[PDB]
Every structure is written in structure tokens, then in C-alpha cells.
């Protein structure tokens, strides 16, 4: 039925798959870009915090800036803006200017996000649309390629990278932080984030619940060639719930006026914040689901080896769609690494707890929980733990067994057998002891003769 036409931009119609639709039911034009108010917004390692402002209308900014056309660009987009955290993109930029020389460019579309849900969603086509004139100002004026560029979208920034890359021929890489499901999942790839949108795109969910009733802001859809499900991808550790709902006000909690936990939402950038500094913090496995990988079946890494889950997850070397899965700490340091174990137990039958730690040329673990229950000799139990160091070689373990009952004639239990598997790590360690130890005491193992 309807179209609007901006310059330089192209025309926008709230024809299908816009609007009219089963999932977009509202026939919506984008605001113009007067309205929407899109500014570009560069930082570099000379200018870390105070931006230099490019504009679409006069492309000698670029030229007047501290732009470098030697160094990779990463343009981060915003989408929910949580009122107690609003300069995690800045805070985004300083971390990369920390391992890199970069070019960071960020995209404040406020004003364009600042509207009803459904409007804001819509108002994503001219603010990719934007992006993507950006993007090709650099190529035919600057001749600066978009192979050497990266877009990093959070929430429904997401599908703004998404849209930018779509027009954008031999855009290197985007990342999706969390994209949203509302209004995105289930629609045709021109509408939302998807492989074809770049050389490269890796999604983290981090709110995927279904919106209705869970409230979960993020999609389950697979979105890139790399999606990772940190922590199953729903419920991240450290963050409170939403309460269940069959009724979403989705234009009160846009607007900030209605209660809304924004945690699950916002974990997907900040574990990306994270891994810049910790580059094998966050090793993913590739698994069919969340409940396989936490019944140990997907570890250790395949032979081609994991990938990194944030900054990294470029360096990937075997790559069609691969679902990746690990855990994270509740906080900061959110990085983990996952050892896999396996006790063969000796001395006398009882009944507890046994637990690992295990003592390397980097450091040594907390005592993790292995197996509880009925312990007898002889028999073998085995499990995987994500411990927060990576404690190099290992050249030691210690056992202890535990209960919480009065045990009159003070049994001695023992491992014969200690096998410690890291997940990254081809070699598996062997340890021995002869020794058994009594209740709540630590047996040390020595390497296997
Ligand atoms: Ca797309
Ligand atoms: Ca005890
Ligand atoms: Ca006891
Ligand atoms: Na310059
Ligand atoms: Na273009
Ligand atoms: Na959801």
C-alpha cells in the first residue's frame, strides 16, 4: 500500500515482510532520518574519550578526523539501554584500545530507538540503511574496504548491523549481542540478522526465552554461522528473573516506564567486553543441545579445537550453523575453563562426597564436587567442572571425601586412578596414589609411573 523515500537511502513501503504480516501485523514507515537524529560517533587510540563527530553530509569529516586507513574499524551499535548503564559502548572502545589500534565508531540512534517497539523496530531499516552509506562513503571516497570492518549490534542494534551488512558487499564481520526476538524472530533474512549479512557473523544469547511468558528480550533463532549459548543462553548466573507474564508491555518496558530485569539482556555484552582481555576465557563447545553438554557428552574439543565465544570467535579455524555451549562465572571474572575427571575409588565402602583439585605451573583450583553417594572400591566416576584458571601443566591432584553423618569406625577412602582431561589440551594426566585417606582429609596423587 504505502512507501517513503529518503535521500541517499532509498524507499522504505510497510508492505510484507515490513508490516502486514503474522509477526509484523502493523503496516509501519521508518522515521526519517531527521527524526531518528543518527550520529556517528569515532574514538581512536589518539582520542579515547572524547568522540570527533563524521557526517553522512559531508564526507571530508571523515578526511578531518583521526580516522586511520590503515587500521580495522568496529562500528558498535546500541539497542535497550538500561538507565544504570548507558556508556558500556565507550567503555567497549577503551577496551579495544587496549590490544588494538582501531578505528571505534559508535552509532547513537536514541532518538530512533526513543519511540513506541514496533516504531523503533521499523526505524532499524534507516539506521542500517545509514550504517550502510557510511560504509560505502569509506569504499568509493577513502577507498577503505568493508573487509577491514566489523559491526557490533546489541539487542536491536543487532539487526541494524544485520541490515547495514546486507547492503553492504564483503562486510568482513558482525557480531549480535543478544538480538532481539520481538518483531525479528521467524521473519525472512532481509528483516533480521542472519549468515548471509556478513563474511563472518557469531551471535551470543544471553536472554533467549520466549518473550511470552518468560519475558526473554533475546531470540533462540540462529542468527550466524557461530551461535553461542553461554549457560544454557537463557538464565545467566548473577542474574535475577523476570516475573512470568502473559501480558508483555513491550512499548512501557522500551520506554523505561515499566519494570523490566535487563540483566540476562545486557550479560551478552558484557561478556564480550570480557573476553578482549581474556582471549581463551570463553572456549565454546559444539553440542546439540545445553542438557547434552551439562551431561558431559560434548567434551573435549574436537580436533580442529574450539571456539572462542566474544572478541575471538574470528580466529575460529573449522567452520555451515554450529551451536556452541559453556559456562560463565556469576561475575566478573566471568571466564572459565572446563576440565573433565575421572576418580577410581579405593580403601573401604562409604558413603559421601568426593571432590578434585587440581595443582598446576599457573596456579591451582577451588575442590569441585565429582560424585556423591554410595563409595565403593573399585568403581569409577567421572565428571567435567569449568574452574576459573587455566592452571597450565598439571603436576598435581588432591582428593578428599566428605559426609554429614557420625561415622563411628572412621573408614579410609582412597583413588588408586586420577585422569584430568583439559578441554583445549590433546594430552589427557594420569594420577596414582596407593594411599586412602580418612574423612575430610586431602590425598595428594602424584603423575602415573
Ligand atoms: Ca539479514
Ligand atoms: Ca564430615
Ligand atoms: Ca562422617
Ligand atoms: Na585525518
Ligand atoms: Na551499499
Ligand atoms: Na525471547
Given at each position: 500500500?504505502?512507501?517513503?523515500?529518503?535521500?541517499?537511502?532509498?524507499?522504505?513501503?510497510?508492505?510484507?515482510?515490513?508490516?502486514?504480516?503474522?509477526?509484523?501485523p502493523?503496516?509501519?514507515?521508518?522515521?526519517?532520518?531527521?527524526?531518528?537524529?543518527?550520529?556517528?560517533?569515532?574514538?581512536?587510540?589518539?582520542?579515547?574519550?572524547?568522540?570527533?563527530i563524521?557526517?553522512?553530509?559531508?564526507?571530508?569529516?571523515?578526511?578531518?578526523?583521526?580516522?586511520?586507513?590503515?587500521?580495522?574499524?568496529?562500528?558498535?551499535?546500541?539497542?535497550?539501554?538500561?538507565?544504570?548503564?548507558?556508556?558500556?559502548v565507550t567503555?567497549?572502545?577503551?577496551?579495544?584500545?587496549?590490544?588494538?589500534?582501531?578505528?571505534?565508531?559508535?552509532?547513537?540512534?536514541?532518538?530512533?530507538?526513543?519511540?513506541?517497539?514496533?516504531?523503533?523496530?521499523?526505524?532499524?531499516?534507516?539506521?542500517?540503511?545509514?550504517?550502510?552509506?557510511?560504509?560505502?562513503?569509506?569504499?568509493?571516497?577513502?577507498?577503505?574496504?568493508?573487509?577491514?570492518?566489523?559491526?557490533?549490534?546489541?539487542?536491536?542494534?543487532?539487526?541494524?548491523?544485520?541490515?547495514?551488512?546486507?547492503?553492504?558487499?564483503?562486510?568482513?564481520?558482525?557480531?549480535?549481542?543478544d538480538?532481539?526476538?520481538?518483531?525479528?524472530?521467524?521473519?525472512?533474512?532481509?528483516?533480521?540478522?542472519?549468515?548471509?549479512?556478513?563474511?563472518?557473523?557469531?551471535?551470543?544469547?544471553?536472554?533467549?526465552?520466549?518473550?511470552?511468558?518468560?519475558?526473554?528480550?533475546?531470540?533462540?533463532?540462529?542468527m550466524?554461522?557461530?551461535?553461542?549459548?553461554?549457560?544454557?543462553?537463557?538464565?545467566?548466573?548473577?542474574?535475577?528473573?523476570?516475573?512470568?507474564?502473559?501480558?508483555?508491555?513491550?512499548?512501557?518496558?522500551?520506554?523505561?516506564?515499566?519494570?523490566?530485569?535487563?540483566?540476562?539482556?545486557?550479560?551478552?555484552?558484557?561478556?564480550?567486553?570480557?573476553?578482549?582481555?581474556?582471549?581463551?576465557?570463553?572456549?565454546?563447545?559444539?553440542?546439540?543441545?545445553?542438557?547434552?553438554?551439562?551431561?558431559?557428552?560434548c567434551?573435549?574439543?574436537?580436533?580442529?579445537?574450539?571456539?572462542?565465544m566474544?572478541?575471538?570467535?574470528?580466529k575460529?579455524?573449522?567452520?555451515?550453523?554450529?551451536?556452541?555451549?559453556?559456562?560463565?562465572?556469576?561475575?566478573?571474572?566471568?571466564?572459565?575453563?572446563?576440565?573433565?575427571?575421572?576418580?577410581?575409588?579405593?580403601?573401604?565402602?562409604?558413603?559421601?562426597?568426593?571432590?578434585?583439585?587440581?595443582?598446576?605451573?599457573?596456579?591451582?583450583?577451588?575442590?569441585?564436587?565429582?560424585?556423591?553417594?554410595?563409595?565403593?572400591?573399585?568403581?569409577?566416576?567421572?565428571?567435567?567442572?569449568?574452574?576459573?584458571?587455566?592452571?597450565?601443566?598439571?603436576?598435581?591432584?588432591?582428593?578428599?571425601?566428605?559426609?554429614?553423618?557420625?561415622?563411628?569406625?572412621?573408614?579410609?577412602?582412597?583413588?588408586?586412578?586420577?585422569?584430568?582431561?583439559?578441554?583445549?589440551?590433546?594430552?589427557?594426566?594420569?594420577?596414582?596414589?596407593?594411599?586412602?585417606?580418612?574423612?575430610?582429609?586431602?590425598?595428594?596423587?602424584?603423575?602415573?609411573?
Amino acid at each position: 500500500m504505502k512507501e517513503v523515500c529518503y535521500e541517499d537511502l532509498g524507499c522504505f513501503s510497510d508492505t510484507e515482510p515490513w508490516g502486514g504480516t503474522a509477526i509484523r501485523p502493523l503496516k509501519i514507515l521508518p522515521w526519517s532520518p531527521e527524526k531518528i537524529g543518527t550520529r556517528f560517533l569515532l574514538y581512536t587510540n589518539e582520542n579515547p574519550n572524547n568522540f570527533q563527530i563524521l557526517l553522512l553530509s559531508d564526507p571530508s569529516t571523515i578526511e578531518a578526523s583521526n580516522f586511520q586507513m590503515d587500521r580495522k574499524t568496529r562500528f558498535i551499535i546500541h539497542g535497550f539501554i538500561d538507565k544504570g548503564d548507558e556508556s558500556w559502548v565507550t567503555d567497549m572502545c577503551k577496551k579495544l584500545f587496549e590490544v588494538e589500534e582501531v578505528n571505534c565508531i559508535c552509532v547513537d540512534w536514541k532518538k530512533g530507538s526513543q519511540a513506541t517497539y514496533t516504531q523503533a523496530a521499523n526505524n532499524v531499516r534507516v539506521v542500517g540503511a545509514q550504517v550502510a552509506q557510511m560504509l560505502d562513503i569509506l569504499l568509493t571516497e577513502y577507498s577503505y574496504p568493508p573487509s577491514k570492518v566489523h559491526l557490533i549490534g546489541h539487542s536491536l542494534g543487532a539487526h541494524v548491523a544485520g541490515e547495514a551488512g546486507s547492503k553492504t558487499p564483503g562486510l568482513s564481520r558482525i557480531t549480535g549481542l543478544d538480538p532481539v526476538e520481538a518483531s525479528f524472530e521467524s521473519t525472512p533474512e532481509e528483516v533480521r540478522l542472519d549468515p548471509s549479512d556478513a563474511d563472518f557473523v557469531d551471535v551470543i544469547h544471553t536472554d533467549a526465552a520466549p518473550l511470552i511468558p518468560f519475558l526473554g528480550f533475546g531470540t533462540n533463532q540462529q542468527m550466524g554461522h557461530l551461535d553461542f549459548f553461554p549457560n544454557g543462553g537463557e538464565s545467566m548466573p548473577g542474574c535475577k528473573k523476570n516475573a512470568l507474564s502473559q501480558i508483555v508491555d513491550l512499548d512501557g518496558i522500551w520506554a523505561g516506564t515499566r519494570d523490566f530485569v535487563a540483566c540476562n539482556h545486557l550479560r551478552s555484552y558484557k561478556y564480550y567486553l570480557e573476553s578482549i582481555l581474556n582471549p581463551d576465557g570463553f572456549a565454546a563447545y559444539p553440542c546439540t543441545s545445553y542438557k547434552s553438554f551439562e551431561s558431559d557428552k560434548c567434551f573435549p574439543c574436537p580436533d580442529q579445537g574450539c571456539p572462542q565465544m566474544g572478541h575471538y570467535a574470528d580466529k575460529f579455524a573449522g567452520r555451515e550453523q554450529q551451536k556452541f555451549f559453556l559456562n560463565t562465572g556469576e561475575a566478573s571474572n566471568f571466564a572459565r575453563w572446563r576440565y573433565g575427571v575421572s576418580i577410581t575409588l579405593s580403601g573401604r565402602t562409604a558413603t559421601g562426597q568426593i571432590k578434585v583439585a587440581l595443582f598446576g605451573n599457573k596456579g591451582n583450583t577451588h575442590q569441585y564436587s565429582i560424585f556423591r553417594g554410595i563409595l565403593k572400591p573399585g568403581s569409577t566416576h567421572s565428571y567435567e567442572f569449568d574452574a576459573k584458571l587455566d592452571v597450565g601443566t598439571i603436576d598435581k591432584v588432591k582428593f578428599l571425601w566428605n559426609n554429614n553423618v557420625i561415622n563411628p569406625t572412621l573408614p579410609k577412602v582412597g583413588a588408586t586412578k586420577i585422569t584430568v582431561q583439559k578441554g583445549e589440551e590433546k594430552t589427557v594426566y594420569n594420577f596414582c596414589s596407593e594411599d586412602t585417606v580418612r574423612e575430610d582429609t586431602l590425598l595428594t596423587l602424584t603423575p602415573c609411573p
